[PDB]
Amino acid sequence: PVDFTGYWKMLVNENFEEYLRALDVNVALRKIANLLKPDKEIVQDGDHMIIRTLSTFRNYIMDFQVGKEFEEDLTGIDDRKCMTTVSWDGDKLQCVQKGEKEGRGWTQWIEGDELHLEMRVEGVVCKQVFKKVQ
């Protein structure tokens, strides 16, 4: 497939508040989250991927094998646990996070020189777009 490795800076973040509200994040944390601009630092070797979502407040780290289900600990976000699987769909990554909230997951892909991420939960869609600094 494709190599997502890079330090990607956020350009776009649409509907993040609604996405966090659907995860039951409290108003205090939503307030500070509202002014963050999380970046993505990704290192990949084939199906082995580390995706670090980096902000000045808190980071969220994923470390997984594409195609292999794992127990995802969402401490720092909503502090839930999911049965999560990230899969290749051509050159896109499709993530399903099974657990309390229905329809939770995300899709990540590169379009030209932009990293696109669509995060989903209970019918809410949050759109994020990132670019490396040339």
Ligand X SMILES: CC1=C(/C=C/C(C)=C/C=C/C(C)=C/CO)C(C)(C)CCC1
Q: Which residues bind ligand X (CB under 6 A)?
A: 20, 25, 33, 36, 38, 40, 51, 53, 55, 57-58, 60, 62, 76-77, 106, 108, 117, 119
Cβ of residue 92: shortest distance to ligand X, in angstroms? 12
Tell the smallest beta-carbon distance from residue 108 to ligand X (Å). Answer: 5
Measured between alpha carbons, how far is 91 from 107 in angstroms, rounded to an integer? Answer: 11
Contact predicate 8/40, CB 8 Å: yes
Q: Among residues 41 and 134, whose Cβ is nearest to ligand X?
A: 41
For the bound state, the minimum distance from the C-beta of residue 13 to ligand X, rounded and expressed in Å, comes to: 10
Who's near 58: CB < 8 A, 6+ residues apart?
A: 76
Q: For residue 10, say whether it is annotated as part of any ligand binding site.
A: no
C-alpha distances (whole Å) from 95 to each of 33, 70, 82, 132 are 23, 11, 11, 23
Q: Is 108 annotated as a binding residue?
A: yes
Annotated binding site for all-trans-retinol: 40, 62, 108
